[PDB]
Design a protein around this ligand. Sequence first.
Ligand SMILES: Nc1nc2c(ncn2[C@@H]2O[C@H](COP(=O)(O)OP(=O)(O)OP(=O)(O)O)[C@@H](O)[C@H]2O)c(=O)[nH]1
Ligand SMILES: Nc1nc2c(ncn2[C@@H]2O[C@H](COP(=O)(O)OP(=O)(O)OP(=O)(O)O)[C@@H](O)[C@H]2O)c(=O)[nH]1
Ligand SMILES: Nc1nc2c(ncn2[C@@H]2O[C@H](COP(=O)(O)OP(=O)(O)O)[C@@H](O)[C@H]2O)c(=O)[nH]1
Ligand SMILES: Nc1nc2c(ncn2[C@@H]2O[C@H](COP(=O)(O)OP(=O)(O)O)[C@@H](O)[C@H]2O)c(=O)[nH]1
Ligand SMILES: [Mg+2]
Ligand SMILES: [Mg+2]
Lengths: 430, 430, 427, 427
Amino acid sequence: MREVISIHVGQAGVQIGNGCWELYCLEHGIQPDGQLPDAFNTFFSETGAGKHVPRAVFVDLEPTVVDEVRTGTYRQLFHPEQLISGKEDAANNYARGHYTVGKEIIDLTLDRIRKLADQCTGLQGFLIFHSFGGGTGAGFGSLLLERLSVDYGKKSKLEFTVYPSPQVSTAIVEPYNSILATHSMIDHSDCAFMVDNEALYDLCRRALDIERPTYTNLNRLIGQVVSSLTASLRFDGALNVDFTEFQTNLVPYARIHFPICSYAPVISAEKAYHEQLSVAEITNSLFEPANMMVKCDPRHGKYMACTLLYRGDVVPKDVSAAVATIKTKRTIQFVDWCPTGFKMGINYQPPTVVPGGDLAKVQRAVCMLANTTAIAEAWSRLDHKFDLMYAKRAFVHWYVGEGMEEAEFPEAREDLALLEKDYDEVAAES
Amino acid sequence: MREVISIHVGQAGVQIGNGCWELYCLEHGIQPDGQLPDAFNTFFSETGAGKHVPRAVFVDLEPTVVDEVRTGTYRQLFHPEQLISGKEDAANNYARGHYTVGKEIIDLTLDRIRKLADQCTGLQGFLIFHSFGGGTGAGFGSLLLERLSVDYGKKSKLEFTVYPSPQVSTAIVEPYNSILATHSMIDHSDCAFMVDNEALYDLCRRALDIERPTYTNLNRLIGQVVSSLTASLRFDGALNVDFTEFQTNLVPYARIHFPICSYAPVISAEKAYHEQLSVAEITNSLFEPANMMVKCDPRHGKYMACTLLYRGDVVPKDVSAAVATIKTKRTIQFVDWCPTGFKMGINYQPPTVVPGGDLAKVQRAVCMLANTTAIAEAWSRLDHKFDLMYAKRAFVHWYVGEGMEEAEFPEAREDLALLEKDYDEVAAES
Amino acid sequence: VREIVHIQAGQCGNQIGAKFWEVISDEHGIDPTGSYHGDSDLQLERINVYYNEATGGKYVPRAILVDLEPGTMDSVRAGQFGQLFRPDNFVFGQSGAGNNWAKGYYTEGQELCESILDVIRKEAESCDCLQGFQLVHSLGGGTGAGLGTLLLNKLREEYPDRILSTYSIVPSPKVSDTVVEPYNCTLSVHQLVESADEVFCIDNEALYDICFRTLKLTTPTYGDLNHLVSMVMSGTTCALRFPGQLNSDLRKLAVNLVPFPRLHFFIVGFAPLTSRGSQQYRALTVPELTSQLFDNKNMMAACDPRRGVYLTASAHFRGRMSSKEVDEQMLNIQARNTSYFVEWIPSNVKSAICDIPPRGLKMAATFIGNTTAFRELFTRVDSQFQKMYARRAFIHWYVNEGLETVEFDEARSNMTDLIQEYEMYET
Amino acid sequence: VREIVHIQAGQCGNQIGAKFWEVISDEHGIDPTGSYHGDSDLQLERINVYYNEATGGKYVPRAILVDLEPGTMDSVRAGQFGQLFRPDNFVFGQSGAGNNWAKGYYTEGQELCESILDVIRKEAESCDCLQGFQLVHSLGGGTGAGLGTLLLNKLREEYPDRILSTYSIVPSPKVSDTVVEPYNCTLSVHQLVESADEVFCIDNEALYDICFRTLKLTTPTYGDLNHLVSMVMSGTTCALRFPGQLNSDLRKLAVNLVPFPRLHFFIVGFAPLTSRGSQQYRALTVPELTSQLFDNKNMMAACDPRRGVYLTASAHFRGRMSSKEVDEQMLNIQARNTSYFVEWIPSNVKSAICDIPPRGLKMAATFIGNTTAFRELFTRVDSQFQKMYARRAFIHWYVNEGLETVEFDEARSNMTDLIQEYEMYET
Ligand SMILES: Nc1nc2c(ncn2[C@@H]2O[C@H](COP(=O)(O)OP(=O)(O)OP(=O)(O)O)[C@@H](O)[C@H]2O)c(=O)[nH]1
Ligand SMILES: Nc1nc2c(ncn2[C@@H]2O[C@H](COP(=O)(O)OP(=O)(O)OP(=O)(O)O)[C@@H](O)[C@H]2O)c(=O)[nH]1
Ligand SMILES: Nc1nc2c(ncn2[C@@H]2O[C@H](COP(=O)(O)OP(=O)(O)O)[C@@H](O)[C@H]2O)c(=O)[nH]1
Ligand SMILES: Nc1nc2c(ncn2[C@@H]2O[C@H](COP(=O)(O)OP(=O)(O)O)[C@@H](O)[C@H]2O)c(=O)[nH]1
Ligand SMILES: [Mg+2]
Ligand SMILES: [Mg+2]
């Protein structure tokens, strides 16, 4: 029919991949064994009898995360070829995952990705997951994209990655890997969505009523966003939105392609029992900085083109009333040369609950993707943290020994500066 | 009705012949005793009552391999005259197997093969098997082929021989026997197929999932290819291909005749759950260098002529679509002076499985035979290996002592250089 | 025998098309299986205008559906009237819509254009006569806006004589459904002005507003919105389909309402409209119909006529009614509001009467008018176009397809002159 | 009483003929055991054309089977209509098929030719009349291409007056089934041009294309492919077998379509063809048949007529129909598309009418045309032959059968002139 291919890289990619594919199978009708006790063609392939196989590839340079899937409940669903495991991980080193160890397995991975592309007659794009701080996520991820750019060209390569948190950090060398990866992301990727763990931690505690979450809860929220994005591509709706439509709207400039993401309603299973949650309520909740899943305040900057996606009971008449109310908010800023700024789409399939889930059975819901100049706040923090470590040359020795030429350090520094200039240059007014 | 004769020389030929008739009895449905619990007369002969007999001759200069069949379960199937065993083998010496000991038994075997041809009214080809490194495979094989050329003349002499592996080697004198036999094969053989164990081992581990194969597993893969090749003569099909049809199309020159072989799909049980195995997929697999049973990359050379053989569920519509897709892949090279390069053959009889087997019960399958200059990579390695021995005269004394004149060593070297010139001259373009 | 070929493009056109054929099939009395089970002989008089006959006692519409993705088409197949359409007329691509006017016009348009044209040629050259082509498409999208204009140029080249009447949905200014709406609309206007004889502009804002004011729909869906459009084309071609005291077809309409080749954009409205519960209290006569027709709240285009002046107007009436009563109202409404009509063209209101009303109404009326209020619509898009065009960057998505930057200047230049052309004639 | 002798050569010829006799037997109503059990007396009027009588009211076809090896007819013996054939007509060799034109013509051809000719002489001189011979063979192969041309010359030598009409499959233009096809085809071209009155060219690629486009067959087999071809020869001989308003036999066809002795290669096509799902919606009539016939996609040979120009054309019609409607259509399609017809020949299109259509179809049509588009077909094999002929070595296989160097040069030179001959007449 028309297909989308998913590639997952690293520990973050695999565990997010679990959350996504539970929700998809636990939305469509497919048992963990592949049988049934429609939109199947978009995400699954058919092998005869009654068995289905996902269109996904799982990649990591170490076996612990992958072998959890091989020994897990959902082991039977996946094709053993799809699960690729390395021997020893990159140890959070960009050069090690790019030049020495990454090139040992890069050409093995692309064959299977290309092999899956043959079955996809109506392929319209790819979805790729990363962790910026990781060695395999940033190192191997950059190498994978650079090849896929020349392999396929004019096919949308959409990405959904975890940006480093403003203060929460689990890796000391986190600034080094992110900036080197940033140069590779910007020139080859069509569009890449940012999310950070620190915002999700605060959201998963405040909106969802959880005292002490784990990575499993955060991945479940991530799964909802991706499903709503593809909901226009799977089931019927009064306003369909294709992948190619997101590419044109959300990208004003060739290098300003990073959006930021939000979802509403985010309420516990208990407290939805009191609230009606009309179209106006859920639309109003999105624009508050508290809900948004990146820890940057939009009020610091300005807004760009935005996208709204509605699921379930929504009627188009109430959307126009709600969006018009949004424009009356003087707390929300727009540039004069972007007067329209909105694309809306509606799908009738309601959101799907999760086994042992954290969300309520809401009849209607809305997903939101927006480009904003407030992301320059995130870039400045990463830029400042990088200069302190490079000024005294805190960790250069590890990266040099693994094949990286030091001249890459100033180049990635310079390219980040231009992007910071681009966000300020576009933010200017005439 | 229409007959083909099989001759097996050396230990490798005897063991392969055991596997080959093991497959044919299952394929036709003939019990090991010759009774039944069609295409029988092509491979078998009836003796009245209900007993059949293969049209095969087993020859080796030592009784160990032959007596295994004599004492084995299949002993009652074979005719006692067909099993000919010598007294002492050639000791991996070409001169011993050609001049001294080879001439002791050459005319005893030649009566036996000619006797079998009397009962073959429609005899239109022979199948002869070799191991190049063996003394009897090279020394006696040359003496047999030289006689069979003048005994029968314009009758197709097809050969299926195991070429020495690029690095896997079990005989020190291996380069010596290969070059000496090379002169004999090129002039007298109508067409000889190349295979090597090293490529067989790798495919038997990657595609077929075997940790540690034996020679028995490798022989069964060989038997599948021969069965598919002979299926056109034996069973009904929309595109019948005769031995003469293979001879005319595959070889563009007299000496360039050497083809290469491939087979698809080669899959285990659980891997076949997840793949639909369409005609396009199996044809695509035949062209990856990983599937060649000769360990030479086709990308090093070019394609001159190809023949495709399909069995079972295949429909001619999808063959034309599959082949046209192959033509678009110009990572695959054809010379301009051969634009067509293909003959396809379609048969309805599916592959036959074997108890204790290694292959999954696939509904459709395809076999591949093609000629290429990628083989010239293999000849260059053998030439460089030989010169190191002959420069210091590493093993001349053994061969001269067994009747061989030294002058044959440079002449066989010169013939190899002339053949290598032919392939490179053919590779030239206008 | 004045057959009309119907073409639908884009997500907007197909969903409009599905509801449109429900209205026409219901009026003629055709079973969703394609068989006639109606109640009057007059229905079978001139059903040939929209339908073709199949030998198995079947009636098939003269419809061609165009889209770049099958998702919209597969919804129509699952529709109630899906079986009615001829199976081979579905022409679709295998690539995303892109929402890009340049991509739809150049990359995917050329490949689809040749295949679509011959399918059109099948229905075009199959019947005894062909008066005009009817097109439904959106101007804010990429598929209908791009490929629809390309096919419009080719239709003119092969059939210059025929009336290329089109129905378009103009991007709503208050709440836009696409960020790149000004680019797509401005480029398409250049193609539409020079090629199309008749263009009717429809805004979803009024459809929302009319539903909320009059019909009192708490949750009006696109079904109701597309339904309010449905009678507009149904009423227009009704003069061809049924007898009347004064017939007025498309060519009569174009001659009267178009004073100059470039001033032909029209506003449309329908009467009567009443909430589904307040209909009891309302006596229904011809003067009551006229009051709704000229009321500024009933226009489906969000451009207030009072802010401009009228040049030409036409009214259609359906049902057995007095001819004097219709004629007197045109005189009365013209003299009462002389401040909104040009002095140098007298009798700016055209009239027509049709014998048979539509279903669900005993008397009904349709209004089509042309006025300088369109300057409001073009001012909104042009002002937004200048805002966007200085920030050249969105042309990046158009440059990669192959579009030259001077085309944007040409599109603005021609549309600017169209604004000026309406300005001068106001004097 | 216009008996026609049928000869089948090679793998392709025998399997097409086997499907051919299924169609003819069903049309006449001949039971597979060889006895009449049909439904109409009209079937018995002129069954003598293809069938020879046996004792006990049994009818045997006038068919001769030719091959180099027994495998092919053993499948024929197991066929559903295998019992129908005369046992002695099976003539075959006991050597390899070869796939070599030189081997099939010289080595095994001479032995086969003498035995086959007397078998032909059995049926040729057994009936009261003999109008022409019918041959089915492959050109990309070795047996049918080689031995068929040898037998073709001998048939002319003994029977110069009789019509030597043959059906041939052409080596495919894009993806084909043999490496040495240009050698086999080019050598046969020299024999085919001078000896055969009428040659029809057939392509498997068009057969694949027609099945996928119109019939929507997911897995079209050779049974379906041979079925579509079998309509063509069945329709051509239908004029002899049944009465009609305008009779047109083979000799009528040859005189009209062939302007010069060498320009006689023909393209064929059949109508109507419709998918099973969409056959309900069609309005099957005479004009609908005309649209399919001149449609470039339906033509069974991959040589696009629009790239060339027409010299002559002929259409056959079956069924009780209007004579005016057929005569009007042939004029309209002629004047509409004059750009593809030669000026110096008026009335480029021929027409004919037959009374009885095939089973299940109330109406059917067959189209045969001649055009310069065949220059595309010969250019493909010519360029490939030159690319082969620089590489001498393949001749070495043909040298073993006595084929000399001059034969390849002679074959290309005549075929190149055939391309030139079509080039000059385009002016
Ligand atoms: N939200 C979320 N983030 C995760 C998850 N797992 C890992 N991460 C992020 O990944 C970072 C650590 O890098 P890795 O997970 O190891 O990614 P990698 O590219 O495989 O790095 P290597 O293991 O060295 O190869 C952490 O700081 C987390 O922010 C997860 O399950 N959910
Ligand atoms: N693939 C495969 N190769 C075999 C097998 N048996 C023997 N060979 C090959 O045979 C080579 C050794 O020569 P021999 O098997 O002794 O053949 P030979 O001609 O009888 O040599 P002699 O015993 O000296 O007379 C090895 O290098 C193998 O490559 C077998 O069962 N399978
Ligand atoms: N009234 C109405 N408007 C619609 C419908 N579907 C889409 N639209 C409007 O059409 C505009 C553009 O539609 P789009 O999908 O881009 O059309 P396309 O890209 O040319 O196929 C949007 O602003 C929608 O609001 C419908 O069913 N009814
Ligand atoms: N349509 C069709 N084509 C066939 C059939 N059998 C063979 N062919 C085609 O005929 C060509 C040559 O066939 P070949 O076996 O060499 O015929 P022969 O050597 O003359 O007997 C090939 O390209 C085949 O594709 C058939 O049953 N149907
Ligand atoms: Mg890792
Ligand atoms: Mg031995």
